[PDB]
Structure 1
């Protein structure tokens, strides 16, 4: 059984690759440069010799401490890429081990900043953004949120090799060189998406404190969302620690998550987000009590608007038809995901934009 079941657990991984051929290509490339020291301008060529997509150039330069003096030496560059190659047998592992804080083995929001700083300074479609500025910094925050929204499906603050492997993120890093219109990469890096998100935030945050409150958020989309839903964003259901509940204030970062969830509610993250908000007691089911608590306010608003509001009991029957819950009289998160109509369910209980 030592034989018949060979070892299936690998701390690191498995694979094959010629590490010396690559050290060599790096070496000849670095020999083109004054004092065999690569400058940030030179790192396209070095990224390519490493066998990496162009836009790993920032992380690579950073990884070898090149940002310290404005240039890195061939011996130091080789030393660390060597260690990567020896220990990281796939793209996702390599990228983590480049950006990560030592010991960690996971990526945190700030770890992505040197990467994104380079995308902004370098990519054709973001030339107008180069300047150190407000829109410069805010685009960076936004994209990081979008990375985490899609990749970090556990909601821990920590993007993991596994999660990275499972996402499409590194394919978008790849596509950056091929696509000069950044808007084409709609999944994380789109500027036009970020422009919408930021202008939506900017118009509410009138004191420009970069912090927004229940009153401010209530003004979004002409108070399209219900008040009971709004006060729920500040409850602890979708933000970390004690701060938000204490101060009744969310950051821009948090508003990005809110807004992306409002934009599209079919999404597995969005469904988790809104479910968290609706499960008032946290028991993992949406009891009829919890539903009626929201629907009563939809009703008064439909009334204000002189519309016949479908009575709760007739509504509950429609909702239970729409989501096809696995166990009778208990709406769970899983049921909501299976049904494909989560968004109509959610809108029915806390949104009035139709019309």
Structure 2
């Protein structure tokens, strides 16, 4: 278990005397894919879409593989992922879009388009203001502030790469990585549990925003009863990440506390 494929792969791409991979270590590999793969060959003629594609794929790799959030990928993380399997499928499939995991170009396209849509001041960075000027209703400024606070890694600017993590997580709150993206945001004190105060702090803005729409919001007491019954935690007042992954309903939970649109759509 020290000389298997995952181990070799780390040795292959790591800097000398290193047993882990950073995002930068995946660049030569991804460049070699854009050059040689028939479904990405058209990117040779736009060597300026290279990075956005390469950066996007690398985000996706770390998003599902780097499960410790360390930023350094180990052979254990590789082993418990289907990444090498995907590389195998990558060599037999001429249509890159049929590779829905990591490499799909249409997947990258959608992400790049949404980044473009949001960058309202056109500076190629996503600010807190950019999100407010696109969609007043979707995400709460309190949850936005958490992201821009460094809860999921102040300059006040979100790069394109960090936006990838945001977009994937906002769209799909079912996969485990997304669940802890939002957990890190809601868990302000970092205690590993979502306290009543924390829950109250986020729900407070949801009430201000509903009342601004002429909608009478549900009182917190009744909300917490619906939510606690949905999660099925261990300890009554102590809601954990493990409880959220288990209940398979974390997306409804999360939207209730910081996404006004997706909440009203329920």
TM interval, short-chain normalised: over 0.9
**Higher RCO structure (Cα 8 Å, ≥6 apart):** 2
Match of 2:162 in 1: 254
Match of 2:226 in 1: 318
Question: 1:206 Cα deviation (Å)?
Answer: 4.1
| Counterpart contact for 1:218–1:230, Cα < 8 Å | no
CA distance 1:171–1:219, change in 2 (3 Å): farther
Which residues in structure 2 correspond to 1:1-355 (within 5 Å)?
13=2, 89-239=3-153, 246-353=154-261, 354-355=264-265
| Counterpart contact for 1:176–1:182, Cα < 8 Å | yes
Taking structure 2 as the reference length, the TM-score comes to 0.94
Question: 1:117 Cα deviation (Å)?
Answer: 0.7
Task: Tell me the SS of whatever aligns to 2:40.
Answer: helix
Taking structure 1 as the reference length, the TM-score comes to 0.71
Cα deviation per residue 1:306-331 (whole Å; 9 max; x = unaligned)?
33322211110000000001011111
Match of 1:18 in 2: none
Which is higher, the Rg of structure 1 or of structure 2? 1
Q: How many residues align?
A: 263
Q: Distance in 2 between matches of 1:208 and 1:103?
A: 42
Question: 1:90 Cα deviation (Å)?
Answer: 1.7
Cα deviation per residue 1:274-308 (whole Å; 9 max; x = unaligned)?
01101122222211111111112112222223333
Q: Distance in 1 between matches of 2:14 and 2:203?
A: 46
Q: Distance in 1 between matches of 2:251 and 2:106?
A: 24
Match of 1:22 in 2: none
Question: 1:179 Cα deviation (Å)?
Answer: 1.6
Question: 1:213 Cα deviation (Å)?
Answer: 1.2
Task: Tell me the SS of whatever aligns to 1:118.
Answer: helix
Cα deviation per residue 1:4-51 (whole Å; 9 max; x = unaligned)?
xxxxxxxx73xxxxxxxxxxxxxxxxxxxxxxxxxxxxxxxxxxxxxx
Question: 1:217 Cα deviation (Å)?
Answer: 2.6
Cα deviation per residue 1:167-213 (whole Å; 9 max; x = unaligned)?
00001100012222111111100111111111111122245443221
Q: Distance in 2 between matches of 1:218 and 1:128?
A: 36
Q: Distance in 1 between matches of 2:147 and 2:178?
A: 13
| Counterpart contact for 2:120–2:133, Cα < 8 Å | no
Q: Distance in 2 between matches of 1:332 and 1:295?
A: 18
Q: Structure 2: 5+ residue runs without aligned partners? A: none
| Counterpart contact for 1:294–1:349, Cα < 8 Å | yes
Over the aligned positions, Cα root-mean-square deviation in angstroms equals 1.6
Question: 1:254 Cα deviation (Å)?
Answer: 0.7
Q: Structure 1: 5+ residue runs without aligned partners? A: 1-11, 14-88, 240-245
